[model samples]
Target: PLHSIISSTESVQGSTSKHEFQAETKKLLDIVARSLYSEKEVFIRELISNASDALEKLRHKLVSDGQALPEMEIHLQTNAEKGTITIQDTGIGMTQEELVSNLGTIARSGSKAFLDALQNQAEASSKIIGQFGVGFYSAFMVADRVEVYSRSAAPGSLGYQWLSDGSGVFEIAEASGVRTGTKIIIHLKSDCKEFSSEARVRDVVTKYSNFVSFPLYLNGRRMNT
Candidate 1:
């Protein structure tokens, strides 16, 4: 299923491609930013879901390929001084092009059709949104800036950095020293400084991602909560 989805959308351009969201789509994005979502805490849940999915994918690869898989874990670090929270996962990371495609656009969502199928089904809407690729964009809700550093699982692959301020334009460039997974650094908005609290962040993770297959740690301490 993953292969089929990727194959179908692989032709779609990445960040380097000159693709612009339609006017209506842009309006929808603006709405999402300003008033679509009701809760600010949803961003943490969305990130956890993405991390869980990544771990699931890597587990499948290890079973099928019989390769030496890296340690699978989620690490949460908080910098109160900088008002930043970092979430790191040792799962399949994205290549430069993949990062651009996944982070830069909305129509190319892995679950695009799934979301469309539930547009009018209110009961199923939450489930579909959880599946949609737009979860990354939810970061804009509580973050003034978001940075993603990733290194592909492919051997000898170079790392990539993706930065966005939620202003409809993002920057992507080559990076170094990234491990074989995704690392997201979120600079919290002044009003959303609660996210920088270690206790609060840990509570959020435990609530939504406790059952995640990967190990979860907060500030170097294993989170059993």
Candidate 2:
């Protein structure tokens, strides 16, 4: 059995398109930023887990495409002066449609399931990241803005940017010269400026994502070693 469901409505005026998120999604975004986790630092863990997932997806795709894969790695760059942290991965990126669909709405069923589990105060873990699909939204906990630049691994795909302040709407525009995979730039909030420090970032990466299968780097240094 199937039913019609519309997640978002958009208006395209130029190369960029603006869309408003579903009301339910807006509520979840607030919940994710506010009380979804007991600690704010979990956003770092969530984002790193997302990058690792992207790399794993790319590796799986390469096995069937028979293409020699480029170096697969996750890199973190912190700018204390600008109060921004960038997490980039050489992995399977999203096409324009996938960008809209994947980031547009938390799956209706998944949201319900996640909420059900949250009622019981289940400990948040890595497995919950994929199962619940709100890991990306966790960025809002410490960010004033989140920008994602992605270019799909599919041949001939164009790069795109998705930007949101997590205030119920987002905009997408065509981007030029983007490399394969994804790059996320988190514009850190003033009070959250500590996250932009190299030492703090290294500590978090070592704590949560050190064992991820791919090589990880931070500001020109190998982090996993």
Candidate 3:
């Protein structure tokens, strides 16, 4: 029997709200963080792919509307002292609903079905990973906290921030001075501070995102070909 995991305590203060992950989403997040991928470093690759997708979406919309598309870019900054890696993209940022749906829901009811199929059929596990998209959860493999700041490309849309510790609860609030794109800040765990290094980020970009179409900047230096 599948059920939603709505928190009984959704306290709304001003523009912010606290929420609980759907039960299956919590389970999936746990699996993705702990066991789904052997290489925890793949979180870098997964996040880059998300940024690329957003940029491509915005590019298509502009082109189809007969408007000139601007130079879209992805920027990665790592801070060893802070144990954080920030990945920002000039792309189609999420609206409030999109943020809640995309990050909060975890594919809605499909999460339960995906988890059930994975557990019941051992041989199908590998194929399921390809079919289901849970790339965002990979951040939890290394992150102690994950924060997303986004402002939609739509004119006059307000910005918002989504913060979570990947522990089944998240908070969303209005943000000011956010750019018209998405910026994700991953606070790395103490043992995972290697990801919060300039050299390490550059190596991951070179190894994984060499073919990204948009310009990628790592600590202000372009890394993409």
Candidate 4:
């Protein structure tokens, strides 16, 4: 049975339809998709950074709200059969509007304060490799298709799925049986098959996310080696 989750609700205002981006946003997205970055592997780094941030948040909250924190871990599953790679974390998830606003559009970041901190710390910024506002777009550099499924940490909040192919438009819809966390599934481009291998995936994880706070798994195995 296909179950549907009521992800979000929005109230329309006035006679104007609200479905267009400001010109600067469109131009920024274009540049991000076409330029502004140099490596395809940066996507992995960005996602791992996000997972780490989520784990850190939960760890902090556990001090005061200890009852809800789950075991922290990061899982990487590669399914060559379906040509998909999934990165999942057992941390706080986003609501439907959050999924759309974060993945479908740019400039709305959960880590805006962190970004501002980075800018303030120029010397440290060179060591840090994340731009919370725009890093999500890096998935398009290597994925022909990308799907994000998430359920918010708030009780009774519904789950949602966001899908895109970097075609300037994305679809957001209800999802079924999603846990309270985020899962990013990437359909690697035909030329980017190297990412599908367990060895290659481990190397990437070690390079950028070795210091992440959660357990990192590749294809169901811990990536300690």
Best by TM-score: 3
Decide which is better by lDDT, 2 or 4: 2
Model 3 accuracy (lDDT, Cα): 0.77
Question: Which whole-number lDDT from 0 to 100 does residue 60 have in model 4?
Answer: 59
List where candidate 3 sits over 4 angstroms from the true fold: 1-14, 63-68, 108-117, 123-133
Give TM per candidate.
Answer: 0.75, 0.82, 0.82, 0.72
Show pairs that collide, candidate 1: none
- Lowest summed-lDDT stretch of 10 residues in model 1? 1-10
Number of the candidate with higher TM-score, 2 or 3: 3
lDDT of 2 at 41: 71
**Residue 169 CA displacement from its true place in model 2, Å:** 0.3
Which regions of candidate 1 fall more than 4 Å away from where they truly are? Answer: 1-28, 36-38, 63-68, 107-134
* lDDT tens digits, residue span 1-225, model 3: 322111111223337788898786788887766654446777787788888999998877674667676658888888889889988888999998888888876664545666777888874544565555457877888999998888788878878889999998998898876777888999999889999988987877797567887878887777767
Candidate 2 residues lying further than 4 Å off, grouped into runs, are 1-14, 36-38, 64-67, 108-111, 117-133
Residue pairs with backbone overlap in model 2? none
Model 1 TM-score?
A: 0.75
